[PDB]
Amino acid sequence: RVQAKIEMEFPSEDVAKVVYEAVLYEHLSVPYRRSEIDFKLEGKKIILDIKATDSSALRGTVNSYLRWIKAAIDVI
Amino acid sequence: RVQAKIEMEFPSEDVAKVVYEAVLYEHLSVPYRRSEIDFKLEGKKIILDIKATDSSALRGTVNSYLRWIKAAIDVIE
Amino acid sequence: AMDPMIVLGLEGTAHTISCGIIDESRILAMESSMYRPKTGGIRPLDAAVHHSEVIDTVISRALEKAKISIHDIDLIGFSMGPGLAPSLRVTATAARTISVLTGKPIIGVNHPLGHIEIGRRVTGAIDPVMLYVSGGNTQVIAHVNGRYRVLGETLDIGIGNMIDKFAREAGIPFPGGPEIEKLAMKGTKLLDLPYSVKGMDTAFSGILTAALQYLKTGQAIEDISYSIQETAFAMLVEVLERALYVSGKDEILMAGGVALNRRLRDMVTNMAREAGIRSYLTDREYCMDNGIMIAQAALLMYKSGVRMSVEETAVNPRFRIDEVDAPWI
């Protein structure tokens, strides 16, 4: 099994707010779990905690979330 | 700046050795980073330590390495 | 005695991931897994991932093919040659591991070399001129100064893409090639297309735009499609003829996805009669990317003493074919 932990800081604490919200709505929409994800909001910093069976499975998960996040930011 | 840290355990300590080696050659091979990565071997577990500017950069880097390790793993198997 | 020396080849520069196994006299095994993007055009990051998941099953189904014991493999040649970064590193890595897993040596092969040597092998040509016509590659190459030298080439667009970006502008599924091949059949007249040969080099942008402009003019398509073939293949037939009677040789080889064109084969074997030199039409299947053409180009390298410890190995997306010494003709 693989372990993953990401953290990205934002300019202000409210940008984190908005974003987390945008992704969190997506987190909750997700039907499948090729891996388990733990979503959390910190200071001006969102935190990810993934646990995959394999590395390929871990990979695709990260692409989803990391691709959701760049989505948020960029609109903003 | 984003921060990343990945760990995957292998059945035995030597499988770890092998995969490390295989991918280590690739680590060194690369000319241009779209982010800064730190490669390490532990017990039977390889460690990744990434520092990227944005989330689109970090992502691509991860995809690379994670694809490399799945290559090594699958060959051995 | 020195047992029949066995090699295993890994090709993975573009979209095809394949693994071959041969020895001096045999072709024990070989199968590929092509990444088929229903879309069309280059898709690098998607390609590597394709590979990454099926590279496992190719190299392993192969061993079963050759029905040879895993201990029996002697060398391990991968395609470090020119290509797409994501894919090359996947192949490179996979090999660097198999070499360890099976405990044998390893060398990096150049990609187009394999096309020559596998074609040369399959036909029995001693020192031919090669017509490399793949994706974005229009190459005419020959062994001259103890190394394979590139003589002429496309200065704009690889003939294969000009073909496909017309299909993908004339509304056609990305199986572009053959769709226009078995289309130029019902071509009645020949329209006019910018014929650009200059030395042994060529240009294709001209052909395309002049073809698209004819398209909206509301011309026929079978006519346009028909004209483009005869006009561009005309440009290759000339360059070829020239390449021969420059480096002075008496044989030809066609390699690439373009090289599978029924009419192109004709326009070549025809020039053969008029040039007085053999037009070896390579096995119709070895024209696409295969892992085994790598094994063949490695075999030759190792046999002539060229070797490289694992550390030295690393991909090279910009690998000139005249960068490798080919001292065996």
Ligand SMILES: [Mg+2]
């Ligand atoms: Mg090719």
